[PDB]
Symmetry: D3
Subunit: 81 residues, 6 copies
Amino acid sequence: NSKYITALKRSEGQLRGIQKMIEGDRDCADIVTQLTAVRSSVERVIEMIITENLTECINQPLDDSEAQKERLEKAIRYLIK
Amino acid sequence: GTNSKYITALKRSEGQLRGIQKMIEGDRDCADIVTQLTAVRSSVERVIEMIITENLTECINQPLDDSEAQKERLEKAIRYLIK
Amino acid sequence: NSKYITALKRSEGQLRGIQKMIEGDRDCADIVTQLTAVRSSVERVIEMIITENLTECINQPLDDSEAQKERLEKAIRYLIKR
Amino acid sequence: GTNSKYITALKRSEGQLRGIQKMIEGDRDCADIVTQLTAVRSSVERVIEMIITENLTECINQPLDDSEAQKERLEKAIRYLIK
Amino acid sequence: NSKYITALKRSEGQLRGIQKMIEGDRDCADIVTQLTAVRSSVERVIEMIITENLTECINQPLDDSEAQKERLEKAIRYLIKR
Amino acid sequence: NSKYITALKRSEGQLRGIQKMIEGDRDCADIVTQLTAVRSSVERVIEMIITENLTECINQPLDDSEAQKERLEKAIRYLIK
Ligand SMILES: [Cl-]
Ligand SMILES: [Cl-]
Ligand SMILES: [Cl-]
Ligand SMILES: [Cl-]
Ligand SMILES: [Cl-]
Ligand SMILES: [Cl-]
Ligand SMILES: [Cl-]
Ligand SMILES: [Cl-]
Ligand SMILES: [Cl-]
Ligand SMILES: [Cl-]
């Protein structure tokens, strides 16, 4: 949905800002702090997509038993990777 | 040189974020969206690790001549590695 | 669960146990090992709770499909954290 | 089919362990030795995750008809995922 | 360090704090959050100790090169754990 | 050194045993327990090699400053990967 796109757009804005921080010779801690914030915000989108995908696989199973087996397995594999 | 390498990587990553944005607007494939999101996450983490690694390295390789300054400097460098 | 409250007593007592050793200038390797054990015992309570909550969520779903979806999402989100 | 897939992977891994053994006896390259050790570790972890994933999947997809049995079964399946 | 002993008091008190809530059949989401905070506060003491020990190991090496090697190895091994 | 080879040989023995466990239709928990033990023993060799390598880079630096910089960085990168 459209909540991810806002969050991705922000991360993208922060990434170009961090570019300006390196190209202006800012220090290790200021740069790492911002990069970590970008990293967590991307990870949070990843987690939300994985969570929603696994929820829908559990909550709305396919008719075919083997198909539903393979679909849950793929959803869970993302959870533990 | 070091710093240009970082900026190339970060510009790749922000480019991939825009691509991923277009995917989600299209209700495009969910397994693909996670794969490329993970690729962005990994490349950002790569830059983080390189910066922390270089910082710690030059703490060890180029110690400060004030001993208390050097203790505090190394502690911060190691804590960045820990976190 | 008095399951958890006995485990939280062990850990809490282990913490003041550790605290004597730091007061003691005592063996640094021991102190870390003992702190790590406290950390793990707390974590296993955390994992037991979130496991139970997701189990109840899967086995006893809400009546309303949308409510159950939001409920599953939150239960799953507690898994992918540490 | 499932089980043959696992055995192929595990036999690859034990083969790579013997290769790594020969490397260390030769005082061979340390960066290579870690890379391939990590590859073995990853492939073993892949088998672990597949087994835990399938176990959890068939807990959900094929629930037990005793309700208390099914609660205990699912709890163990999720705890394997957690650990 | 009385640095650590104040932190270990907060955590230990937070644990019996949590324990009231489990006795309370209290909000499950809160309980996990509060346990996670205890887990993190213990971990940060762990990381502070191992960071200090490796710092002292790098800055104040032993006289004997082999002894220093074994000493560095053990200090580094405490990093790569969780 | 030769302590790694003993440990690797054991892991290799356990891996073929786990093969016999699957090919004899043993259950999820027994198989996972053994595979986890193999995984930790491999990881422990990895950690020991990384630890020793980083120790020697710190304890026995190269003469050249840039060379020593790149060598420590590679050693530390393995530590945090
Ligand atoms: Cl994260
Ligand atoms: Cl943010
Ligand atoms: Cl690289
Ligand atoms: Cl991380
Ligand atoms: Cl101490
Ligand atoms: Cl696969
Ligand atoms: Cl793991
Ligand atoms: Cl509870
Ligand atoms: Cl491990
Ligand atoms: Cl073993």
